[PDB]
Amino acid sequence: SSVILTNYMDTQYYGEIGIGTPPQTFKVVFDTGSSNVWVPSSKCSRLYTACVYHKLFDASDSSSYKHNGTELTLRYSTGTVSGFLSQDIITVGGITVTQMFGEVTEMPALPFMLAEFDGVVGMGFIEQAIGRVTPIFDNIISQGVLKEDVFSFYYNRDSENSQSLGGQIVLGGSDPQHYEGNFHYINLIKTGVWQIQMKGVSVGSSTLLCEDGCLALVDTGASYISGSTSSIEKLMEALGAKKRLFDYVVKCNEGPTLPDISFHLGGKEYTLTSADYVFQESYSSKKLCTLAIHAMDIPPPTGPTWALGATFIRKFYTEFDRRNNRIGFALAR
Numbered sequence: 269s270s271v272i273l274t275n276y277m278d279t280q281y282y283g284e285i286g287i288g289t290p291p292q293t294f295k296v297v298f299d300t301g302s303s304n305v306w307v308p309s310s311k312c313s314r315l316y317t318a319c320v321y322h323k324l325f326d327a328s329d330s331s332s333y334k335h336n337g338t339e340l341t342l343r344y345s346t347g348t349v350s351g352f353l354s355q356d357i358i359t360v361g362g363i364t365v366t367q368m369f370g371e372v373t374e375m376p377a378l379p380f381m382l383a384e385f386d387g388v389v390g391m392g393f394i395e396q397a398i399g400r401v402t403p404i405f406d407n408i409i410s411q412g413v414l415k416e417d418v419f420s421f422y423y424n425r426d427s428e429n430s431q432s433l434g435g436q437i438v439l440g441g442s443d444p445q446h447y448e449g450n451f452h453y454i455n456l457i458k459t460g461v462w463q464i465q466m467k468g469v470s471v472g473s474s475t476l477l478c479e480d481g482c483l484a485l486v487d488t489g490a491s492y493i494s495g496s497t498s499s500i501e502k503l504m505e506a507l508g509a510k511k512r513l514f515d516y517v518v519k520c521n522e523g524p525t526l527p528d529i530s531f532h533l534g535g536k537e538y539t540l541t542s543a544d545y546v547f548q549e550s551y552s553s554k555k556l557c558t559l560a561i562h563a564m565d566i567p568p569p570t571g572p573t574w575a576l577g578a579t580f581i582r583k584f585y586t587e588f589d590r591r592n593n594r595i596g597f598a599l600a601r
């Protein structure tokens with residue numbers, strides 16, 4: 269099965285899922301970085317403006333709903349959400365699955381008022397699941413219908429004409445149509461985490477970063493590529509970038525001349541051109557241009573670690589292999 273994704277300014281890739289009977293529609297981000305499923309709840313206090321601006325699941329309108337009520341809190345790198353568990357059938361690209369998910373009753377204005385989407389569908393392992401809830405992918409696999417025990421991600425560059433798919437997720441395989449050359453895999457380090465060993469990070473003619481090795485979380489739910497504050501501060505000064513709020517910028521006229529950034533993964537340099545990681549929205553020296561890379565200090569046992577998000581995935585088609593506990597990359601097309 270495939271799920272069509274929408275691309276909002278290269279920073280938000282979301283698809284749709286139906287919940288309940290009849291189906292209640294939601295826009296969600298598919299996050300390989302987490303393992304729970306959640307959407308805003310109709311029981312969410314309207315004092316939270318983000319709940320006023322998003323689709324809300326109403327259990328009282330679903331005849332397939334199954335109550336549970338266990339409270340859970342989901343902590344993500346850029347924000348937190350709180351609520352309770354409920355069970356109901358969920359549709360994902362034609363596949364129907366009974367799923368335990370979180371109904372959110374607390375959703376902070378920042379950052380959710382900036383979300384064009386409603387909720388989240390974690391694509392991570394149960395090991396990372398809060399409340400020890402079974403992940404939606406495991407449940408689909410239990411049906412023993414997917415041809416393969418893997419799922420692929422394709423993130424298109426944002427177009428100006430809404431007739432080009434923003435992105436695509438293939439459940440149970442990959443779409444040859446969106447990648448060329450051969451896949452190149454790297455076995456996962458830790459157990460139950462889409463994280464792999466990174467052999468090095470170079471900025472031009474200097475492997476000035478991650479020498480001696482580091483970790484890399486392949487994160488579909490991340491807009492930018494991220495490293496530890498320390499790593500970023502070093503990379504950024506090597507780029508002549510200045511930190512504004514919590515991200516970096518360069519003088520637009522300087523963006524095109526920025527150097528290549530490479531990530532050594534499983535013996536294979538994955539190179540990002542400046543055109544690949546800078547939002548070139550001008551060429552003026554009188555304007556600032558943002559970089560799709562910022563600091564993100566992820567706590568142990570998963571972090572410290574770099575995180576490869578949409579900036580990276582946009583260039584390299586990614587396949588997440590469950591059976592072989594590995595990740596594969598291939599030139600996107």
Ligand SMILES: CC(C)C[C@H](O)[C@H](O)[C@@H](C[C@H]1CC=CCC1)NC(=O)[C@H](Cc1csc(N)n1)NC(=O)[C@H](Cc1ccccc1)NS(=O)(=O)N1CCOCC1
Pocket residue numbers: 279280297299300301302343344345346347379380382383384388487488489490491492493494495564566570575576577
């Ligand atoms: C084990 C952990 C690391 C996994 C992590 O929890 C998970 O991958 C998901 C959760 C989910 C977080 C919320 C919903 C989708 C995914 N992802 C994140 O939290 C990421 C931050 C991150 C961690 S590592 C990396 N590289 N980037 N968060 C983002 O990329 C946000 C998404 C976003 C949130 C709200 C509105 C609009 C866009 N965009 S953003 O960074 O450019 N910016 C931030 C400030 O507000 C405005 C948007």
